[PDB]
């Protein structure tokens, strides 16, 4: 059935706000947060940057990815420059020139701080280095992404039970598990790390079409189909043999996985996607659209193991719910998913945008009041989730308005 024409002016409106947010609000704030003494970007930002804060692998790679994609969407010199800044700091400070891969964190001046090799962070490095290669033509960045991929496969893969160990010691010799709560046996595997390895690989495969990436992608899809997302929620924490550990639901990770999973299975089998994939992913999406309805137009942060819900309205969760709802329309052609996206985007514009202090709040109450005691930028919040949501929104909405 044809698209309800009443959605057309709404989508054109949102498209324009996506572009203003990206280029007039998000990027200008981060452009002003580069370290002119040490390079890279400041490690922690609240009311202003703290240049004594350590700089994370994830955050630095997210800024590299963000400014690569922004230069590709609009070739402003400032973006390539910032990308180059994030790249040099990634490859001269966070890079372990002895044992390869990337350190978890370094000091302001780039001295290694946490030397552990987390696959989560090394994944993001691959993701961001592939983006940088595309945007800058830099051949060494792709070689480094390939070296890191090789480590993820050669040292990271559990070849007995499938999937990847969470983390390794500096020399990549000893797997380290993910620490959970006080007193509980730590988890050797997490959905979170597995999802972002998939995310990196889809993009490394898009950039290179190397069949070894596609094969690792296949492996990852089977892990998600069988162990991580068998039913309608993604399990959080798993033993080595994939037994579930702990519990709980991450609403943002659920919605995020549906479209990241879609990207990978589209890269593997093209459009239209397999019916088994549609049938698999649809109830996860339906669960998310009903949770948005129950919770009044925006997404809670998580369901704890004991059933209580963290009702904080967190920036990335909303952002990912936006891309996820657009993706669900393109998959199942049910315009109500667009209603949801529009609803989520309005929530973001109304409450998560900080027009006073810049960028987006980490989180607000279900009513929209900003939560105190969180940073604006740091180890856990960079420029990726929101910039991506704008770039993904712009490309997807355009396709909708030009075709459907």
Automatic annotation (TrEMBL):
Keyword Isomerase belongs to the record: yes
Protein EC: 5.1.3.11
Signal peptide, first to last residue: none
Xref: Pfam families: GlcNAc_2-epim
GO BP field: carbohydrate metabolic process
Protein origin, superkingdom: Bacteria
GO MF term set: cellobiose epimerase activity
Coiled coil: none
Reaction(s) catalysed by this chain's protein: D-cellobiose = beta-D-glucosyl-(1->4)-D-mannopyranose
The entry's keywords: Isomerase
Stated family: Belongs to the N-acylglucosamine 2-epimerase family. Belongs to the cellobiose 2-epimerase family.
Its job: Catalyzes the reversible epimerization of cellobiose to 4-O-beta-D-glucopyranosyl-D-mannose (Glc-Man).
Protein name, as recorded: Cellobiose 2-epimerase
Species per Swiss-Prot/TrEMBL record: Winmispira thermophila (strain ATCC 49972 / DSM 6192 / RI 19.B1) (Spirochaeta thermophila)
């Amino acid at each position: 059935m044809p698209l309800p024409t009443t959605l057309r002016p709404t989508l054109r409106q949102i498209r324009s706000e996506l572009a203003a947010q990206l280029f007039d609000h998000i990027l200008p704030f981060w452009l002003g947060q580069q370290d002119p003494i040490h390079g890279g970007f400041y490690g922690s930002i609240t009311t202003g940057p703290d240049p004594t804060a350590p700089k994370g692998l994830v955050m630095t790679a997210r800024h590299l990815w963000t400014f690569s994609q922004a230069f590709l969407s609009r070739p402003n010199p400032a973006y390539l420059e910032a990308a180059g800044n994030a790249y040099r700091f990634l490859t001269h400070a966070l890079y372990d020139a002895t044992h390869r891969g990337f350190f978890w964190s370094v000091h302001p001046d780039g001295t290694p701080l946490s030397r552990v090799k987390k696959l989560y962070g090394n994944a993001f490095a691959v993701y961001a280095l592939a983006a940088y290669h595309t945007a800058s033509g830099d051949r060494e960045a792709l070689t480094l992404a390939w070296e890191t991929f090789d480590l993820l496969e050669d040292r990271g893969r559990d070849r007995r039970h499938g999937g990847y160990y969470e983390a390794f010691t500096e020399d990549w010799s000893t797997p380290l598990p993910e620490p959970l709560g006080e007193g509980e046996t730590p988890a050797p595997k997490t959905m979170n790390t597995h999802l972002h390895i998939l995310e990196a690989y889809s993009t490394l495969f898009r950039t290179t079409k190397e069949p070894r990436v596609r094969e690792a992608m296949e492996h990852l899809i089977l892990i998600f189909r069988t162990h991580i997302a068998p039913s309608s929620h993604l399990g959080l924490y798993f033993a080595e043999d994939w037994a579930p550990m702990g519990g709980g639901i991450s609403f943002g990770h659920d919605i995020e996985a549906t479209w990241l999973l879609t990207e990978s299975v589209e890269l593997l089998y093209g459009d239209p996607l397999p019916e088994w994939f549609l049938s698999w992913i649809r109830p996860v999406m339906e669960e998310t659209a009903r949770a948005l309805d129950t919770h009044g137009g925006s997404l809670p942060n998580e369901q704890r193991e004991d059933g209580s819900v963290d009702r904080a309205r967190v920036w990335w969760v909303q952002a990912e719910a936006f891309v996820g709802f657009l993706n669900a329309y393109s998959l199942f052609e049910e315009p109500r998913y667009l209603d949801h996206a529009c609803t989520v985007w309005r929530f973001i514009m109304d409450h998560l945008v900080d027009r006073e202090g810049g960028e987006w709040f980490w989180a607000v109450t279900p009513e929209g009041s900003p939560l105190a005691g969180y940073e604006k930028g740091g180890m856990w919040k960079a420029s990726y989730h929101n910039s991506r949501a704008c770039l993904e929104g712009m490309r997807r909405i355009d396709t909708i308005l030009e075709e459907e």
